[PDB]
């Protein structure tokens, strides 16, 4: 069934930021609750038909690790992308309430993220381009899924920041980057979730022991590309986790790990085996179940 | 008279970008056409009463070089600032259609900008913080006015980029900046308007003679703060204009000119004297009068 603007009705607001805003909605004809994302774009039909035309591949994106897609349409100065409502929200949201996310949980998250990238890469030849806690969604059935990835070339164009960059050093510096760039973002996202705050600049001995101001725009990006990458603090995280992110956070794209290698790395295999109630931990920490 | 959400009605859309969107509206009770700017802000009453409370000083901002203010209010997840509709739009808009803006015209623009900063500084103790072509408005009565400046401390907080920075080198690097930072932005805005495109990176001999790709985020900001500043191309601009922007675009805030000195600089005095029909040139180039 085709989605239309008038067939919907706002329930509430799930958050926004920079385009760029998302409602919990009701699709009257079907009964389903959906997440509707609105992207404002002043642009000529010609293109904003292409965009819509390029978003249709999302119908073909089926994976337990990819947020489900229902349809996209254009409606007075806004293109709308409708997706599965994930009632757990985004990892950036759960991190606030959680203070920190435990190593075992991030292990399950890492497995999800890696299987998603891999799926998008092998079956569709696409890089995510914007991996970070807020583009990782979770639900009460314990599922972990990626959204907001780079399906639309024309949309990639018609968009191209902030105060916190998850962009790899290479991508920050020039046109010479690609899929390996997603690994860096994942690395940084995990060190963030493991530690409770954006890991750059790294915490000093003082803050370190306490846990266990803003930076200027150039100050930040200059650090990322010219200083050593962040590390998981030692002692309080398995040595396997530490090696995993370290393999992720290597400044040189070709030296950095890729999906193949990360898929068979100690921390994955160990996390793969482990028995955890993510659904349980999630609702426990955010009050839902 | 107080402004309320229901007393308005949309006429059309004047543009948007990053917050951040503006309608030509009709204030039913009064009959006036206004520009209504909507800023989305998920935040607690406590503050978004302060913000509104801090925007009231705009009522006290009266100057032929400052965009007129009618009122601000909050309405379901958006704070609204209502201003004089300027039927000429923004200098970034006129630049597209104009290809280039003539030296004589920029001279009048420079006088306006400088008198505005000066007004905000002397009578209200405030820096603009976001001077660039799109925050300079013009109308058919030939008036040139600044908007979007930093009245609200809490709003300054509750906001803190792109692909084109008009931020001074010092502001890009740290907390150690202030009003002198607006001079840099003005300098760069004029070199942009004089030349027809964002002046960084500077044009090569080839493009230079032809007139007469995107950069990466770090590539750009790194250039700004570590390479020489842009210059007006020689030969085709008065030597006084050249000295004016050069005095503006000096990387060191304390060495850079200030408003006092720019106010009595050759190019100003010369532009001050000159007789030009800005109202005429404006409508001519954008089809209005
Ligand atoms: N399918 C969904 N189900 C549930 N919540 C969602 C869904 N999609 C988005 N959201 C919520 O909406 C918020 C805003 O999404 P959006 O992609 O516009 O911004 P963001 O990714 O958080 O930040 P940025 O836009 O700066 O990258 C997200 O943080 C998430 O909490
Ligand atoms: N008072 C006004 N009268 C006429 N047009 C206006 C007025 N205020 C804003 N506009 C138009 O609305 C557009 C969007 O304004 P807004 O401040 O949201 O974005 P911007 O300043 O262009 O870019 P950015 O938000 O990236 O700084 C402006 O470019 C301008 O053309
Ligand atoms: N303030 C910026 C908001 N962040 C963002 N939201 N959607 C995207 C996005 C970008 C490129 C693209 F091609 C998409 F399909 C995109 N959307 C998208 C892709 C897949 C799914 I499943 C759901 C989506 F919303 O980027
Ligand atoms: N996408 C970002 C949009 N750019 C922007 N629009 N308004 C502002 C602004 C910022 C700080 C502030 F304190 C204001 F009053 C502000 N608004 C404001 C101030 C004076 C006048 I006269 C009119 C205004 F809209 O910044
Ligand atoms: Mg997102
Ligand atoms: Mg503006």
Curated annotation (Swiss-Prot), chains A, B:
Membrane-protein topology: Peripheral membrane protein
Catalytic residue list: 130 (proton acceptor)
Result when mutating residue 159 to W: Increases interaction with KSR1 and BRAF
Domain Protein kinase: 8-268
Keywords attached to this entry: Acetylation, ATP-binding, Cardiomyopathy, Cytoplasm, Cytoskeleton, Disease variant, Ectodermal dysplasia, Intellectual disability, Kinase, Membrane, Nucleotide-binding, Nucleus, Phosphoprotein, Serine/threonine-protein kinase, Transferase, Tyrosine-protein kinase
The EC number(s) this enzyme carries: 2.7.12.2
Post-translational modification: (Microbial infection) Acetylation by Yersinia YopJ prevents phosphorylation and activation, thus blocking the MAPK signaling pathway.
Residues that bind K-252a: 84-86, 134
Main location per the UniProt record: cytoplasm
Catalytic reaction annotation: L-seryl-[protein] + ATP = O-phospho-L-seryl-[protein] + ADP + H(+); L-threonyl-[protein] + ATP = O-phospho-L-threonyl-[protein] + ADP + H(+); L-tyrosyl-[protein] + ATP = O-phospho-L-tyrosyl-[protein] + ADP + H(+)
Any one annotated GO CC term: mitochondrion
Organs and tissues of expression: Widely expressed, with extremely low levels in brain.
Positions of post-translational Phosphoserine modification: 158
Impact reported for residue 160 to L: Increases interaction with KSR1 and BRAF
Record bears the keyword Electron transport: no
GO MF annotations in UniProt: ATP binding; MAP kinase kinase activity; MAP-kinase scaffold activity; mitogen-activated protein kinase kinase kinase binding; protein kinase activator activity; protein kinase activity; protein serine kinase activity; protein serine/threonine kinase activator activity
Highest taxon of source: Eukaryota
Class of this enzyme: transferase
Positions annotated to bind U0126: 37, 148-151
GO biological process: Bergmann glial cell differentiation; cell motility; cellular senescence; central nervous system neuron differentiation; cerebellar cortex formation; chemotaxis; endodermal cell differentiation; epithelial cell proliferation involved in lung morphogenesis
Residues given in the record as ATP binding sites: 14-22, 37, 83-86, 90-93, 132-135, 148
Function: Dual specificity protein kinase which acts as an essential component of the MAP kinase signal transduction pathway. Binding of extracellular ligands such as growth factors, cytokines and hormones to their cell-surface receptors activates RAS and this initiates RAF1 activation. RAF1 then further activates the dual-specificity protein kinases MAP2K1/MEK1 and MAP2K2/MEK2.
Free-text comment on this protein's domains from its UniProt entry: The proline-rich region localized between residues 270 and 307 is important for binding to RAF1 and activation of MAP2K1/MEK1.
Subunit (UniProt): Found in a complex with at least BRAF, HRAS, MAP2K1, MAPK3/ERK1 and RGS14. Forms a heterodimer with MAP2K2/MEK2. Forms heterodimers with KSR2 which further dimerize to form tetramers. Interacts with KSR1 or KSR2 and BRAF; the interaction with KSR1 or KSR2 mediates KSR1-BRAF or KSR2-BRAF dimerization. Interacts with ARBB2, LAMTOR3 and RAF1. Interacts with MAPK1/ERK2. Interacts with MORG1. Interacts with PPARG. Interacts with isoform 1 of VRK2. Interacts with SGK1. Interacts with BIRC6/bruce. Interacts with KAT7; the interaction promotes KAT7 phosphorylation.
Protein name: Dual specificity mitogen-activated protein kinase kinase 1
Gene that encodes the chain: MAP2K1
Residues of the full protein shown: 62 to 382 of 393
């Amino acid at each position: 069934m085709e989605l239309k603007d008038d067939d919907f009705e706002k329930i509430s607001e799930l958050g926004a930021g920079n385009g760029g805003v998302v409602f919990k909605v009701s699709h009257k004809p079907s009964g389903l609750v959906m997440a509707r994302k609105l992207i404002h774009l002043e642009i000529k039909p010609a293109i904003r038909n292409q965009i819509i035309r390029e978003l249709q591949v999302l119908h073909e994106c089926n994976s337990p690790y990819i947020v489900g897609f229902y349809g996209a349409f254009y409606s007075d100065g806004e293109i709308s992308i409708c997706m599965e409502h994930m009632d757990g929200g985004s990892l950036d949201q759960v991190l606030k309430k959680a203070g920190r996310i435990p190593e075992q949980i991030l292990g399950k998250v890492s497995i999800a993220v890696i299987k998603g990238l891999t799926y998008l890469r092998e079956k569709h030849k696409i890089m995510h381009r914007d991996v970070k806690p807020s583009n990782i969604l979770v639900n009460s059935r314990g599922e972990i899924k990626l959204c907001d990835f780079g399906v639309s070339g024309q949309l990639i164009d018609s968009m191209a920041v902030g105060t916190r960059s998850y962009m790899s050093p290479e991508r920050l510096q020039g046109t010479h980057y690609s899929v390996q760039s997603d690994i860096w973002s994942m690395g940084l996202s995990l060190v963030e979730m493991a530690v409770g705050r954006y890991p750059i600049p790294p915490p000093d001995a003082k803050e370190l022991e306490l846990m266990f101001p803003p930076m200027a725009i150039f100050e930040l990006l200059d650090y990322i590309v010219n200083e050593p990458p962040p590390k998981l603090p030692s002692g309080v995280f398995s040595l396997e986790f530490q090696d995993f992110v370290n393999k992720c956070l290597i400044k040189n794209p070709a030296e950095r790990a890729d999906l193949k290698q990360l898929m068979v790395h100690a921390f994955i295999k160990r996390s793969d085996a482990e028995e955890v109630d993510f659904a349980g931990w999630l609702c426990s920490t955010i009050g839902l179940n």
